[PDB]
Amino acid sequence: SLVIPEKFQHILRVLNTNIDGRRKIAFAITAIKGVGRRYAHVVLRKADIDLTKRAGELTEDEVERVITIMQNPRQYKIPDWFLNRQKDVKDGKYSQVLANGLDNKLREDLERLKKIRAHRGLRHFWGLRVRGQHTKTTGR
Amino acid sequence: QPIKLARVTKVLGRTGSQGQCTQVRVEFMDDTSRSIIRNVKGPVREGDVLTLLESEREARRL
Amino acid sequence: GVTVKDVNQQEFVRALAAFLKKSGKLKVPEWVDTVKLAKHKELAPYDENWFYTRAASTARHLYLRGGAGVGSMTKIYGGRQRNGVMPSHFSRGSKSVARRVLQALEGLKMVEKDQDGGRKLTPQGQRDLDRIAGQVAAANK
Amino acid sequence: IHRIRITLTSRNVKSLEKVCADLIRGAKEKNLKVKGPVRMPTKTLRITTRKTPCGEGSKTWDRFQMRIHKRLIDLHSPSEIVKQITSISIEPGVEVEVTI
Amino acid sequence: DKLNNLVLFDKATYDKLCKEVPNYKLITPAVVSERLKIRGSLARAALQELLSKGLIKLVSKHRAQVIYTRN
Amino acid sequence: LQSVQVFGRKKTATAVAHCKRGNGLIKVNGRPLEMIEPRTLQYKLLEPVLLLGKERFAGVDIRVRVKGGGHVAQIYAIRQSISKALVAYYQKYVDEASKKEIKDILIQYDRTLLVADPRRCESKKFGGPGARARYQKSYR
Amino acid sequence: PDIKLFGKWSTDDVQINDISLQDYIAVKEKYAKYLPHSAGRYAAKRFRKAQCPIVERLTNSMMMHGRNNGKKLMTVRIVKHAFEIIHLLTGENPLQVLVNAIINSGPREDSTRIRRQAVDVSPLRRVNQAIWLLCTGAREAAFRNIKTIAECLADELINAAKGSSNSYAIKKKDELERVAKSNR
Amino acid sequence: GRVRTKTVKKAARVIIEKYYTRLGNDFHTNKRVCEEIAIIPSKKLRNKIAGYVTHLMKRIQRGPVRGISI
Amino acid sequence: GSVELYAEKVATRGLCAIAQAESLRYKLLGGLAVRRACYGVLRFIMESGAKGCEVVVSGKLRGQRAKSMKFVDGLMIHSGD
RNA sequence: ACGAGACUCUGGCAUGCUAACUAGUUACGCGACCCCCGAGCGGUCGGCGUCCCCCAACUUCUUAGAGGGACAAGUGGCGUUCAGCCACCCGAGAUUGAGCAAUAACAGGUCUGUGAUGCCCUUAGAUGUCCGGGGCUGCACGCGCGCUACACUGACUGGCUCAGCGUGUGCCUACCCUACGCCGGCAGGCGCGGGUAACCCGUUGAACCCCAUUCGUGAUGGGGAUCGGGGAUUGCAAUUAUUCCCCAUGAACGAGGAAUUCCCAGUAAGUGCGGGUCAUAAGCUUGCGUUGAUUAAGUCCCUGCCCUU
RNA sequence: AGGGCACCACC
Ligand SMILES: [K+]
Ligand SMILES: [K+]
Ligand SMILES: [K+]
Ligand SMILES: [K+]
Ligand SMILES: [K+]
Ligand SMILES: [K+]
Ligand SMILES: [Mg+2]
Ligand SMILES: [Mg+2]
Ligand SMILES: [Mg+2]
Ligand SMILES: [Mg+2]
Ligand SMILES: [Mg+2]
Ligand SMILES: [Mg+2]
Ligand SMILES: [Mg+2]
Ligand SMILES: [Mg+2]
Ligand SMILES: [Mg+2]
Ligand SMILES: [Mg+2]
Ligand SMILES: [Mg+2]
Ligand SMILES: [Mg+2]
Ligand SMILES: [Mg+2]
């Protein structure tokens, strides 16, 4: 049980991300942008994966099931309020954006705000604080 | 020189720049005579036993 | 004769939770695998069967002190909320969790609504808890 | 007869106690079953404020406080007799509330 | 330099555990981790397995410190 | 009907022990004396019984009701109340010699078993976070 | 009824070799207690701390730094586990190990820096500084290390009792006495 | 410090000079006598005066005292 | 008709600080010299039976620069209950 | 003679006094549950009731009035043997903490607290007053008070178990504290009650702490800045994010140079809770408890202040 | 030149 298996994977590649196999699975899939601790735990609960095993101990079928549930949360009764992209301003769809998708979403949001020349977009463009913080003394 | 044990028989008074040291008179335990004057750092009172690593020196009023 | 107050309370809670799970008539909400138990928590409970433990704890609290409502339960299960770079403060538990636990215990007929408001143990619930306490004492001895 | 509750409230302990003692002495003289003066916890109203009218100097504070003392007396007597007993001279600063 | 501990036993480390560890006077997860270059979780699990098999004896158990000893 | 009710104090914690003629029961808030938390300080509660022997307590039942203060203060209040209750029961329903000897044992071991510690929290004063500490002073 | 610390460690067999410190290490007879938690007023008057049991003085000195201030239950648990570890490692009485560690850690000569001049050290300050050095060594060994604080305290006490140079307290005492000798 | 002020000392000296025959070495009896024969506004002041009276009575028994003329 | 007002005379006009302050105020408004008015009030207070009194008048008494004149008599306490 | 002291408030003691259904205890009666065994005058009950047609005694615990109590009083030592100092016994206590606070001053602050006020200025295109919008928050930088941290004497997830101070529905005046039931994952929403308060919130189930769990020395499950998306609440109005909630993002920081602050006992420090501000509301302040030390009982070396020549 | 005092001084 405590001896390392022959199929143990030191490094996994999931969604163009290097997942360390030495970490526990829940805190190992948090290496993916868009997956935090809460979302990782709920995904693994939906996937019926034992939380006590390391990332390398997972089989290929288990990894594939985890990836599928991660990329399609709504099909597995993961509630909308759990998602980091709710009611998208362009499509109105609920989803969980991950990794390059998350980066593209951030760039698109900033580009839209700058294109309409909203105040927050201008603050982002100038590189200043955008949530009303004082800038006189901090942020140097 | 062997380590010596002395017994405080009288607390003379405070000494040092900030008054941190206490000047006392000690009588040797090996020989009841040969009482000398020593400077002690820390709270000391009559009847305490000091361990003199060098028993030849004298306080000389610090 | 053994009553609840005669035994170790943590061991009693574990035994009562095991008893409730083994009986298997306790109604469990569909969202137990998704929620966290309070806004001051950072993660969902480690134990998959946290609902049975919470129900056993609630029943023990009602045994010790009857007439407690959902607000009292949320006060009981409240804790410290850390606020990032701001100081920490007391925070209450999940009202839905407390209410569902109380309703499930009522469904088991171990809990009934008190006349003056809140909930209390039925004689059947008191009997069940005293039997569990006797089992805990026997196991310890 | 009716059960009469007299609630006395004051900021002066000495005058409050004098009034309570006089009321109880009157009730005893009229030969009435009187429950002794129940003393409610004293209330301490506090106002803490900066001493300075401006914002200058060492930040010193004034701690003003007012103390309110409350007493309860229970009687079993007719309303007319209770009113006659309460008709005695009441020291200034004592507020009396009679309930039947 | 950073110490790279093992999350799971290899054959040599497992044999070294099962051979030498039941002979220590003081057996704690921290000392076992330091000696065998394993993580604290692996050390705790291994010591629990040894206790279950009866190779070592439990002296004290606490949420912050667990102390075992040789039989 | 032989009984006494004796209190013990520590900070704002107050424990009243009712000691009556009995068979050797000792309870605190209805729980056995060995079940009171925190159990790090269980010997503090057991000290009166360990010092005097179970034979002294074999003839009395003592029930302790404690409230106020914190965990440690309640522990100290409970032990003081138990000791004082046994001393009072002995001095009232037994000879003075037994009371004197048990009181001497308790006093020799620890005076706070019979005499309350009068220390109380000191009031905060303006200009600092507490009773003595002052706010930091700057010059330039 | 013999009183044993934590119900395990007896005080009757504990011996204090150094006669200068015998009046400042309260360990046996009237100073034998079940727990190192008395809530006593030892700081009320001068020298009264000499009556405080030495285990309780160690427990008090373990409540550092600020984040651990006032957590005497935690330090009591730490001391209990450290004594258990010491007994497992040495087979001796943990009280005897603690007494030997304090005796070996107390510096006997110091320098007062009035250019510095050598002065003697009173027994009470010897005990105080020995406890301070032992706790400081344990704390610094345990910081940012998987080794627990109880294990670090046990190792520090064992090394100090043996007089080994692996002990932080022994090294600090040697440095202090060497500087005092130089300024003598 | 426990230095008694001129108020205490002068009151004690006058009390001794006027009522020496009723005073003794017992603080409690002296305190009762002082509260009987003098108007002292506060209990603490009465206790201080009685204590110094007792001290001076011991001194007077041991020998003459300059301040007091009996 | 619920509220009724009555008027009464102060028993010892010389011992009322408010009455004496108003008297001094109207003497000063009447053009009387500061020293004369203050000493008159002081003498009246002392003759009224007071243990002591203090009268302080502050402001531009003479010229533009402001100052205060204090007139004290008898015994006066400052500290304590 | 003022100031000091005395004084007032506060803390600690009273099984002595006064006396309480807006505080309780004990006893008894009824009820619930456990033990057939050893079933009892048993154990647990913040379950109900016992002046309140009539059915029980008391004040230890709580409240708060009166009085008492401590005086360097007793013993030993030092001292001119005075003033007083040190130690010890008995004792709740042998230095609790505050408030008040002299003469004489400062061109100290405040005319932005005032229907306090001299003079000057302005007074209808107003420096009056109201309304709308913006600003007071603006960010290459320097400084001060602070909060959160740098982790394992820890973080996380469960379980268990303890406070005290005090506020609460308002002249104008809109705005109170909230139990319980139901809906929602949460912030919240709906219904229905109590409290103008020792009566209801409330036995104020506080946090730290305690017991287990997972993590394992890795800028890591330490830290939580910054930032995206969504949901609520206050408000006439939330953009320059009011506040709150959810998912996500995951910066510096590995204990801090010269320098420097505060502090000696229930103190420092840790920890939470009230009050003020408040429609919305604490990283501030003013109080409260809880856990609870190391060091010292000294000196004039530094910084100052004071006295004498 | 000498002597006092203070954790808003030091030790
Ligand atoms: K460590
Ligand atoms: K003004
Ligand atoms: K003006
Ligand atoms: K003005
Ligand atoms: K202003
Ligand atoms: K104002
Ligand atoms: Mg992630
Ligand atoms: Mg909690
Ligand atoms: Mg504090
Ligand atoms: Mg005076
Ligand atoms: Mg004064
Ligand atoms: Mg009473
Ligand atoms: Mg000026
Ligand atoms: Mg501003
Ligand atoms: Mg964290
Ligand atoms: Mg990280
Ligand atoms: Mg402010
Ligand atoms: Mg300074
Ligand atoms: Mg310093």
Tab-separated table of C-alpha atoms in Angstrom, chain F residues 51-126:
chain	number	residue	atom	x	y	z
F	51	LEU	CA	-4.241	14.748	48.963
F	52	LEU	CA	-6.970	13.821	51.434
F	53	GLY	CA	-7.707	10.285	50.268
F	54	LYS	CA	-10.987	8.857	49.061
F	55	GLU	CA	-11.843	7.860	52.638
F	56	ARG	CA	-12.649	11.457	53.603
F	57	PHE	CA	-15.022	11.862	50.651
F	58	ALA	CA	-16.547	8.390	51.057
F	59	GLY	CA	-19.215	9.780	53.394
F	60	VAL	CA	-20.421	12.744	51.309
F	61	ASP	CA	-21.941	13.524	47.927
F	62	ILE	CA	-20.691	16.766	46.375
F	63	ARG	CA	-22.358	18.404	43.377
F	64	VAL	CA	-20.658	21.481	41.923
F	65	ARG	CA	-22.363	24.128	39.793
F	66	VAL	CA	-19.903	26.506	38.132
F	67	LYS	CA	-20.445	29.566	35.960
F	68	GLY	CA	-18.587	32.610	34.703
F	69	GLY	CA	-14.953	33.131	33.868
F	70	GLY	CA	-12.994	30.927	31.516
F	71	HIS	CA	-11.966	27.275	31.377
F	72	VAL	CA	-8.897	27.534	33.618
F	73	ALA	CA	-10.570	29.899	36.071
F	74	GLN	CA	-13.508	27.505	36.332
F	75	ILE	CA	-11.116	24.621	37.035
F	76	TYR	CA	-9.502	26.556	39.879
F	77	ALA	CA	-12.881	27.673	41.224
F	78	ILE	CA	-14.122	24.070	41.220
F	79	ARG	CA	-11.126	22.731	43.126
F	80	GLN	CA	-11.280	25.551	45.673
F	81	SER	CA	-15.016	25.048	46.183
F	82	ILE	CA	-14.590	21.298	46.697
F	83	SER	CA	-11.844	21.802	49.278
F	84	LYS	CA	-13.744	24.517	51.139
F	85	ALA	CA	-16.954	22.472	51.068
F	86	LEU	CA	-15.236	19.462	52.615
F	87	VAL	CA	-13.650	21.661	55.286
F	88	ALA	CA	-17.001	23.275	56.102
F	89	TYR	CA	-18.799	19.928	56.259
F	90	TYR	CA	-16.151	18.543	58.603
F	91	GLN	CA	-16.205	21.582	60.870
F	92	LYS	CA	-19.999	21.472	61.039
F	93	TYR	CA	-20.845	17.769	61.396
F	94	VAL	CA	-17.556	16.208	62.582
F	95	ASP	CA	-15.082	17.263	65.264
F	96	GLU	CA	-12.750	20.235	64.914
F	97	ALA	CA	-9.688	17.958	64.939
F	98	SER	CA	-10.512	16.329	61.599
F	99	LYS	CA	-11.273	19.726	60.087
F	100	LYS	CA	-7.962	21.073	61.377
F	101	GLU	CA	-5.918	18.194	59.993
F	102	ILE	CA	-7.489	18.241	56.526
F	103	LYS	CA	-7.194	22.036	56.440
F	104	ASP	CA	-3.519	21.776	57.372
F	105	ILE	CA	-2.906	19.270	54.576
F	106	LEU	CA	-4.653	21.490	52.031
F	107	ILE	CA	-2.919	24.681	53.188
F	108	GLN	CA	0.512	23.045	53.143
F	109	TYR	CA	-0.013	21.821	49.592
F	110	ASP	CA	-1.546	25.018	48.184
F	111	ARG	CA	-3.119	28.019	49.891
F	112	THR	CA	-5.381	28.777	46.915
F	113	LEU	CA	-7.228	25.547	47.706
F	114	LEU	CA	-8.846	27.421	50.604
F	115	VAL	CA	-8.138	31.147	50.139
F	116	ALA	CA	-9.267	32.901	46.975
F	117	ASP	CA	-6.840	34.754	44.734
F	118	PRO	CA	-8.002	38.407	44.777
F	119	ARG	CA	-6.428	39.404	41.446
F	120	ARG	CA	-8.798	41.027	38.947
F	121	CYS	CA	-8.419	42.655	35.547
F	122	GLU	CA	-7.174	46.240	35.662
F	123	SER	CA	-9.113	48.912	33.804
F	124	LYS	CA	-7.914	50.224	30.464
F	125	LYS	CA	-6.805	53.861	30.431
F	126	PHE	CA	-7.097	56.162	27.435
